[PDB]
């Protein structure tokens, strides 16, 4: 059957026995930068095992009324071993990603999650005259939570889930690389994002290349005596990662 899928990067393996498929974002696989497309002149670093491997973020708890969570993903991996260190010591860095969202339940639970990878998901403030903080849009490995109602806070994001913090229709988020975790069908989704930008490399501190959103469209439901705890794990493996512009380390 094609419901089984193994993904091996570096010293890390993920098996899944209820794979939907693999979404390769725009039909393009991560690739290293070529000479016809490069602009930075020094020789790049390509660790390629030390950095291109699965990293697991902190889980989130799917409750019966969760609006959803997001991560700004070039960020969010800055404590992940040598990937984080190479982000710290270089001015430019570049990587694609394998995102794997894991959420298992029983055959008696019902729920549907949309897992989207939104490039340049620039967000708006709750005060429509104000601007956001970095803490408002990202928290590293910690997930940023959407809201079920309009938020009122200066320097915070408008995180009511129906607008996705982006001023759009949430139901249109399927234009981006996405999968659905249907509990009656799935327990894992996986998207393979290449590097997407208007430049060949960028600073991995300054620019959030993409946001991973996990939004429950159909709420988490189960009848009593069943497990009330359903977690959601995200596993991210950088891919074809390279770095340029080595100097002393940034101190956030």
């Amino acid at each position: 059957s094609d419901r089984v899928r193994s993904i091996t990067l570096g010293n890390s393996t993920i098996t899944t026995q209820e794979c939907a498929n693999v979404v390769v974002a725009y039909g393009r696989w991560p690739e290293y930068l070529s000479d016809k497309e490069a602009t930075a002149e020094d020789q790049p670093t390509q660790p390629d095992v030390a950095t291109c491997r699965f990293y697991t973020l902190e889980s989130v708890t799917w409750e019966k009324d969760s609006p959803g969570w997001w991560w700004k993903f070039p960020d969010a991996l800055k404590d992940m071993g040598l990937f984080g260190q190479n982000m710290y010591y270089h001015y430019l860095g570049r990587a694609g990603y394998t995102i794997h969202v894991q959420c298992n339940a029983s055959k008696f639970h019902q729920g549907c999650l949309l897992v989207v990878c939104v490039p340049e998901a620039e967000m708006g403030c709750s005060d429509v005259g104000g601007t956001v903080n970095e803490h408002a849009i990202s928290e590293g490995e910690i997930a940023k939570k959407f809201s079920a109602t309009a938020t009122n806070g200066a320097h915070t994001v408008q995180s009511i889930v129906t607008n996705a913090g982006m001023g759009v229709g949430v139901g249109n988020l399927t234009i981006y690389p996405h999968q659905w975790v249907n509990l009656r069908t799935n327990n894992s989704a996986t998207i393979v994002m290449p590097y997407i930008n208007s430049v060949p490399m960028d600073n991995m501190f300054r620019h959030h290349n993409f946001t991973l959103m996990i939004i429950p469209f159909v709420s988490l439901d189960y009848s009593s005596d069943a497990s009330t705890y359903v977690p959601i794990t995200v596993t991210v493996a950088p891919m074809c990662a390279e770095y340029n512009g080595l100097r002393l380390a940034t101190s956030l």
């Binding site: 809201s147 079920a148 109602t149 938020t151 009122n152 806070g153 995180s159 009511i160």
Partner: protein
């Protein structure tokens, strides 16, 4: 009469240890030692000492005492925590509730020194749903 550096400049992160804190004679080659002020803790890889150099100035300052940080502020159900400048010693955070919820409790909190450490001044408030009239 002979030479010396000025009294070491005041640091927000660290204070001179005894006996240097009472001294005013610091000829070339004098090494003083600091200890962390409340709100800060030692960065062990860095030296907490300054040397009086030959040009009558103290050596370069490094962050041998770094800010003591408060715990994770956590989360408010149906509300939000505004953290505008970090959660280190002296920081401020503020609380609000989403549309349709009313805040009960403190509207802000500060990272202040608490005995041996730093702690949040006030606990997380609560966001209570509102009712329309009948």
């Amino acid at each position: 009469c002979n030479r010396s550096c000025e009294v070491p400049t005041r640091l927000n992160s660290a204070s001179l240890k005894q006996p240097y804190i009472t001294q005013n004679y610091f000829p070339v080659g004098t090494v003083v030692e600091y200890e962390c002020r409340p709100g800060y803790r030692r960065e062990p890889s860095l030296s907490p000492k300054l040397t009086c150099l030959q040009n009558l100035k103290w050596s370069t300052a490094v962050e041998f005492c770094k800010k003591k940080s408060c715990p994770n502020p956590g989360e408010i159900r149906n509300g939000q925590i505004d953290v505008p400048g970090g959660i280190l010693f002296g920081a401020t955070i503020s609380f609000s509730c989403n549309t349709g919820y009313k805040l009960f409790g403190s509207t802000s909190s500060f990272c202040l020194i608490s005995g041996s450490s730093v702690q949040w001044s006030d606990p997380l408030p609560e966001c209570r749903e509102i009712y329309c009239p009948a």
